[PDB]
């Protein structure tokens, strides 16, 4: 095998930040968002990564007992913006250089964009992700949670940094965040 979820700040001090259609809980390190809606994820670095640095997002199941299962869209939702393959859970909006990738070995999907430094007047780089299936399509009986793993990689695909966060795609993110935080 499964992709590692191990936090790895690496040489460049790679960290994530987060800002309802999308709400994040630091307490739970969990994003709550609606299907297909904008999910802004911030990339923070302490120094600039090398030229050709790329940013990959992939979903895995959080529970060890389900980690070998590939996270994909349910049969209903699978059966597109013109760019994303229909099976891919995670899309990127507002980027002209998106790559949708299927691992030849593990069959796992991922979505990659070039690393861009922050825009003038900003301190971080923001990527807008969209999740294209609900957690209720995704986790059968006991509602199986997923993680998004964000990796900073060099141009050859070598690991430069890694962070992750749990995600719940749901109709009412504010309500679910509240409930899970109370629990
Ligand atoms: Zn679905």
């Amino acid at each position: 095998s499964v992709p590692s979820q191990k936090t790895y700040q690496g040489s460049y001090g790679f960290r994530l930040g987060f800002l309802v259609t999308c709400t994040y809980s630091p307490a739970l390190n969990k994003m709550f968002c609606q299907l297909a809606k904008t999910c802004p994820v911030q990339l923070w670095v302490d120094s600039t990564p090398p030229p050709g640095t790329r940013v990959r997002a992939m979903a895995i199941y959080k529970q060890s007992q389900h980690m070998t299962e590939v996270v994909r869209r349910c049969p209903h939702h699978e059966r597109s913006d013109g760019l994303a393959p229909p099976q891919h859970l995670i899309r990127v909006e507002g980027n002209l250089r998106v790559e949708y990738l299927d691992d030849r070995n593990t069959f796992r999907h991922s979505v990659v964009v070039p690393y861009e430094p922050p825009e003038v007047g900003s301190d971080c780089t923001t990527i807008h992700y969209n999740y294209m299936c609900n957690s209720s399509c995704m986790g059968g009986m006991n509602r199986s949670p997923i993680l998004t793993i964000i990796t900073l990689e060099d141009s050859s695909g070598n690991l430069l940094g890694r962070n992750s966060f749990e995600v719940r795609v749901c109709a009412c993110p504010g309500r679910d965040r509240r409930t899970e935080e109370e629990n």
Side-chain angles (χ1 to χ4, degrees), residues 6-8 10-42:
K6 189 70 152 203
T7 299
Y8 178 58
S11 304
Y12 306 96
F14 174 58
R15 306 170 318 288
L16 297 183
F18 305 88
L19 288 180
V20 286
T21 47
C22 191
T23 186
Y24 172 82
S25 167
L28 293 167
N29 183 215
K30 186 164 179 172
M31 168 184 295
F32 299 76
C33 62
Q34 289 176 330
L35 202 154
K37 296 297 185 164
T38 309
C39 302
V41 178
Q42 301 174 343

Side-chain angles (χ1 to χ4, degrees), residues 74 77 132-134 137:
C74 75
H77 283 130
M132 303 303 302
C133 259
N134 289 311
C137 322

Side-chain angles (χ1 to χ4, degrees), residues 2 5 60-69 139 142 144-147:
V2 68
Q5 63 172 99
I60 65 162
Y61 286 106
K62 182 183 176 197
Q63 289 163 112
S64 61
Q65 58 264 34
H66 301 125
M67 269 187 191
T68 63
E69 308 292 338
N142 295 14
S144 280
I146 62 155
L147 307 177

Side-chain angles (χ1 to χ4, degrees), residues 108-130:
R108 288 182 194 269
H109 304 149
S110 61
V111 55
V112 174
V113 295
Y115 177 82
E116 289 180 293
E119 279 180 325
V120 165
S122 175
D123 294 341
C124 64
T125 302
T126 298
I127 299 167
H128 286 170
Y129 292 107
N130 302 331

